Amino acid sequence: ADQLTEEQIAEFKEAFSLFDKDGDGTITTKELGTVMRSLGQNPTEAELQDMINEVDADGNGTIDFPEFLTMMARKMKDTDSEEEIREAFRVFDKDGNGYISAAELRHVMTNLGEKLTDEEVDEMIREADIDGDGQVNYEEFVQMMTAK
Amino acid sequence: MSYYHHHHHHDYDIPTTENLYFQGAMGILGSGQKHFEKRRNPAAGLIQSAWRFYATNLSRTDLHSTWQYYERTVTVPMYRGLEDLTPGLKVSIRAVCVMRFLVSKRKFKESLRLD
Ligand SMILES: [Ca+2]
Ligand SMILES: [Ca+2]
Question: How many helices (H) does chain B have, and how many strands (E)?
Fold first, then answer.
């Protein structure tokens, strides 16, 4: 599953073409960092090298278009990689009914990983049918997010 | 260099002895500093990279560039070229979230396993 239809190739094409400068045909670390820097969020030089290690198995250090397309596309939208996501929650759940409380959920989301501000934490709640007590069923939340 | 000093006085200050004790083996909430502790940062990254992958809307500016195109339409003059190279931020977010997510899976696996 690399596309459903050829329309999606246009979305992938300009996503690549935002990164590539001057038609050299492959994305180097300088180009990859440059788009993010112009937008206004700049990863570390170490992070950029870590990123272009895991992507690009040819191992030359410049990202090719079908390799990028393969990375973007993979299997389309799916209930993907569940054991990796699901067990990640299980390291840090509140109690043996399978939930995380909202106050702790905001504190981990704000201060770890990608570091959310409070409104986008509330947006996570807003996509799930939660009323009253504010306790999040992570296993169900993963089903809703990765629905197909 | 720096030391802590305390004062002790009186007799029979706490005669009752119903101090709590453990009569069995049960799970206790904790972080194992050597290894288990270092999984906090990747797990949060993996979860929040995945959320971006789902997201159709975010608190960030999507529609602002379309409002600038409406200001272009109000002027009476017409230009064949139109806007040039409009930066695609929503497309850019889609491109970086998948890379961040794939890296996050490897980082979760190289924090599940540690030295
Ligand atoms: Ca290039
Ligand atoms: Ca390459």
Answer: 3, 0
